[PDB]
Structure 1
Amino acid sequence: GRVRTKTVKKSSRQVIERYYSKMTLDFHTNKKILEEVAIIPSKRLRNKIAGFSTHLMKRIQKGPVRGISLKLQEEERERRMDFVPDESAIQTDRIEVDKETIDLLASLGMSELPGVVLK
């Protein structure tokens, strides 16, 4: 079989994390980049790492990849996730409460709360 060992996976993950800006989806350019930005004792190991890095980049283009923390992806997610709607998704104008909640509020003395109506 062809299962990349821990060394190849770790090297590809770290290289993508540190140099995502220059990465491409072409194996040959990726291997040249690895030659430039990393020291790999063996040519075969360099080729394997380049191939797995290309695979990881192809996966990343689709969406998030677990174990790889890219600054731009996290920043974009935070920007999208810090937004709020124009109107809050909590309607206090009309509240449908069963009778039991009505006795609850009456015991609390809160029997006149606006927007509280029995089903």
Structure 2
Amino acid sequence: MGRVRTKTVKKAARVIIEKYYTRLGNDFHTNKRVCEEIAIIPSKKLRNKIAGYVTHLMKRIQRGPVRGISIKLQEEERERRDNYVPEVSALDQEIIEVDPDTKEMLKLLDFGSLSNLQVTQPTVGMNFK
């Protein structure tokens, strides 16, 4: 019931972690002195607060990513895991499922490939008013 951080804290911590993720750790008093070294923080109290939020962000990073932050190793990991390729799904083994109305499509476009035809479904009545 009181101490929220101002943006002057929050921005400085995020910027610290963006540049010096490696130096920073969970133990507060270590990285409290890191914050002194790598950044010209004019007051003692402000420094002391920043480090406090730096620790808090570290804890969030050690448990999935954070929205407003760009860690270099996490970005590379993301790049690796979203340029994945499997042996392909758009072939859909042999036998693709198709309807007669979608079969007539293929007749109109001149085709007779490997794909099964099946419908039964009588017009049900979609949603309810």
TM-score (norm 1): 0.93
Aligned to 1:88: 88
- Residue 62 of structure 1 aligns to a residue whose secondary structure is coil
Counterpart-to-counterpart distance in 2, 1:71 and 1:104: 50
CA positional deviation for 1:81: 2.0
Counterpart-to-counterpart distance in 2, 1:104 and 1:79: 40
Report the residue type matching 1:84 in the other structure. Answer: V
| Residue-by-residue CA offset, 1:16-45 (whole Å, 9 max, x unaligned) | 000001111111011100011011111110
Name the Cα RMSD after superposition: 1.0
Unaligned runs of 5+ in 2: 119-129
Counterpart-to-counterpart distance in 2, 1:92 and 1:76: 31
Answering whether residue 37 of structure 2 is matched by residue 36 of structure 1, we say yes
Counterpart-to-counterpart distance in 2, 1:29 and 1:69: 23
| Residue-by-residue CA offset, 1:55-98 (whole Å, 9 max, x unaligned) | 0000001011011101100001111222212x212215211101
- Equivalence map 1:59-74=2 (5 Å): 59-74=60-75
Aligned to 1:99: 100
Percent identity between matched residues is: 62
- Residue 117 of structure 1 aligns to a residue whose secondary structure is strand
Answering whether residue 57 of structure 2 is matched by residue 56 of structure 1, we say yes
Runs (4+) of structure 1 moved beyond 4 Å? none
- Residue 116 of structure 2 aligns to a residue whose secondary structure is strand
CA positional deviation for 1:100: 0.6
- Residue 53 of structure 2 aligns to a residue whose secondary structure is helix
Counterpart-to-counterpart distance in 1, 2:95 and 2:30: 61
Counterpart-to-counterpart distance in 1, 2:61 and 2:109: 54
Unaligned runs of 5+ in 1: none
- Residue 62 of structure 2 aligns to a residue whose secondary structure is helix
Aligned to 2:115: 116
